[PDB]
């Protein structure tokens, strides 16, 4: 809402997880017993970056 | 980088379609010259 | 004898240019097959 | 369900790899596509 | 019409086979060039 109010463009359609990681990284993550959850995927993204 | 890759691919595809068109033209010219060669050949065969 | 020598030379030369035409024909067939293969590849690449 | 989740994961990986390979093959080709038939064969194999 | 039909087969398959005869003549010339080049290389490699 702050960025919309400030006339700053950003993609709303794309979610955080696939924007911050590629499919190969995610697949390796479930290969590494990462639980299949959006929050767990975000946690893995933070643990990487 | 993905934009440059896609531009390269599209350019290559357009070059390829232009090449196949000019190669159709070359094939037609080849057919015509082959036909005229064979015709003269058979004419002088009847001469022999 | 003179007309028979005519036969010899001219007929040798004409069989020679006939083989030349047969060669240009194999080349033309290869070109046509290449054109067909390329067109198939290109109409397969429309989606990309 | 577990078997087909694994199958779908492998299949999506394979589509990604094929698309990337086709892009890089069109990118790295030198000259024209029809100059060499190895590019034609690789593209046809990737399509199939 | 019967004789001309017989000719309008025989003349050209014998033209085709004389064409392939000159093709194998070109093959024989290539083989002979390969042979003499190879023997020159071998006689130049005797000291080695």
Curated annotation (Swiss-Prot), chain B:
Subcellular location: Cytoplasm, Cytoskeleton
Domain of life, per lineage: Eukaryota
Family statement drawn from the similarity comment of this UniProt entry: Belongs to the dynein heavy chain family.
Domain free text: Dynein heavy chains probably consist of an N-terminal stem (which binds cargo and interacts with other dynein components), and the head or motor domain. The motor contains six tandemly-linked AAA domains in the head, which form a ring. A stalk-like structure (formed by two of the coiled coil domains) protrudes between AAA 4 and AAA 5 and terminates in a microtubule-binding site. A seventh domain may also contribute to this ring; it is not clear whether the N-terminus or the C-terminus forms this extra domain.
Function field: Cytoplasmic dynein 1 acts as a motor for the intracellular retrograde motility of vesicles and organelles along microtubules. Dynein has ATPase activity; the force-producing power stroke is thought to occur on release of ADP. Plays a role in mitotic spindle assembly and metaphase plate congression.
Subunit structure of this chain's protein: Homodimer. The cytoplasmic dynein 1 complex consists of two catalytic heavy chains (HCs) and a number of non-catalytic subunits presented by intermediate chains (ICs), light intermediate chains (LICs) and light chains (LCs); the composition seems to vary in respect to the IC, LIC and LC composition. The heavy chain homodimer serves as a scaffold for the probable homodimeric assembly of the respective non-catalytic subunits. The ICs and LICs bind directly to the HC dimer and dynein LCs assemble on the IC dimer. Interacts with DYNC1LI1; DYNC1LI1 and DYNC1LI2 bind mutually exclusive to DYNC1H1.
Disease connection: Charcot-Marie-Tooth disease, axonal, type 2O: An axonal form of Charcot-Marie-Tooth disease, a disorder of the peripheral nervous system, characterized by progressive weakness and atrophy, initially of the peroneal muscles and later of the distal muscles of the arms. Charcot-Marie-Tooth disease is classified in two main groups on the basis of electrophysiologic properties and histopathology: primary peripheral demyelinating neuropathies (designated CMT1 when they are dominantly inherited) and primary peripheral axonal neuropathies (CMT2).
Name listed for the protein in its UniProt record: Cytoplasmic dynein 1 heavy chain 1
Gene: DYNC1H1
Covered residues, full protein: 3196 to 3243 of 4646
From Swiss-Prot, chain D:
Residue ranges of coiled coil: 10-48
Superkingdom assignment: Eukaryota
Disulfide topology: none
Transmembrane segments: none
Subcellular location: Cytoplasm, Cytoskeleton
Domain comment (free text): Dynein heavy chains probably consist of an N-terminal stem (which binds cargo and interacts with other dynein components), and the head or motor domain. The motor contains six tandemly-linked AAA domains in the head, which form a ring. A stalk-like structure (formed by two of the coiled coil domains) protrudes between AAA 4 and AAA 5 and terminates in a microtubule-binding site. A seventh domain may also contribute to this ring; it is not clear whether the N-terminus or the C-terminus forms this extra domain.
Family per similarity comment: Belongs to the dynein heavy chain family.
UniProt function note: Cytoplasmic dynein 1 acts as a motor for the intracellular retrograde motility of vesicles and organelles along microtubules. Dynein has ATPase activity; the force-producing power stroke is thought to occur on release of ADP. Plays a role in mitotic spindle assembly and metaphase plate congression.
Quaternary structure, from the entry: Homodimer. The cytoplasmic dynein 1 complex consists of two catalytic heavy chains (HCs) and a number of non-catalytic subunits presented by intermediate chains (ICs), light intermediate chains (LICs) and light chains (LCs); the composition seems to vary in respect to the IC, LIC and LC composition. The heavy chain homodimer serves as a scaffold for the probable homodimeric assembly of the respective non-catalytic subunits. The ICs and LICs bind directly to the HC dimer and dynein LCs assemble on the IC dimer. Interacts with DYNC1LI1; DYNC1LI1 and DYNC1LI2 bind mutually exclusive to DYNC1H1.
Disease entry from the Swiss-Prot or TrEMBL record: Charcot-Marie-Tooth disease, axonal, type 2O: An axonal form of Charcot-Marie-Tooth disease, a disorder of the peripheral nervous system, characterized by progressive weakness and atrophy, initially of the peroneal muscles and later of the distal muscles of the arms. Charcot-Marie-Tooth disease is classified in two main groups on the basis of electrophysiologic properties and histopathology: primary peripheral demyelinating neuropathies (designated CMT1 when they are dominantly inherited) and primary peripheral axonal neuropathies (CMT2). Cortical dysplasia, complex, with other brain malformations 13: An autosomal dominant disorder characterized by global developmental delay with impaired intellectual development. Some patients show signs of peripheral neuropathy, such as abnormal gait and hyporeflexia. CDCBM13 is associated with variable neuronal migration defects resulting in cortical malformations.
Protein name per UniProt: Cytoplasmic dynein 1 heavy chain 1
Organism: Homo sapiens
Chain's gene name: DYNC1H1
Parent-record interval covered: 3728 to 3775 of 4646
């Amino acid at each position: 809402h702050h960025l919309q109010q400030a006339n700053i463009q950003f993609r709303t359609d794309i979610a955080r997880t696939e924007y911050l990681s590629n499919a190969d990284e995610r697949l390796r993550w479930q290969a590494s017993s990462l639980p299949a959850d959006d929050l767990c995927t975000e946690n893995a993204i933070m643990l990487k970056r | 980088e993905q934009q440059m890759h896609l531009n390269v691919g599209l350019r290559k595809i357009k070059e390829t379609v232009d090449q196949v068109e000019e190669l159709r033209r070359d094939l037609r010219i080849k057919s015509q010259e082959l036909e005229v060669k064979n015709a003269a050949a058979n004419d002088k065969l009847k001469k022999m | 004898r003179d007309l028979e020598a005519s036969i010899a030379r001219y007929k040798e030369e004409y069989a020679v240019l006939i083989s030349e035409a047969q060669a240009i024909k194999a080349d033309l067939a290869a070109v046509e097959a290449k054109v067909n293969r390329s067109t198939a590849l290109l109409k397969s690449l429309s989606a990309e | 369900r577990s078997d087909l989740l694994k199958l779908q994961g492998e299949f999506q990986l394979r589509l990604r790899q094929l698309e990337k390979s086709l892009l890089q093959a069109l990118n790295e080709v030198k000259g024209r596509i029809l100059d060499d038939d190895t590019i034609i064969t690789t593209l046809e194999n990737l399509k199939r």
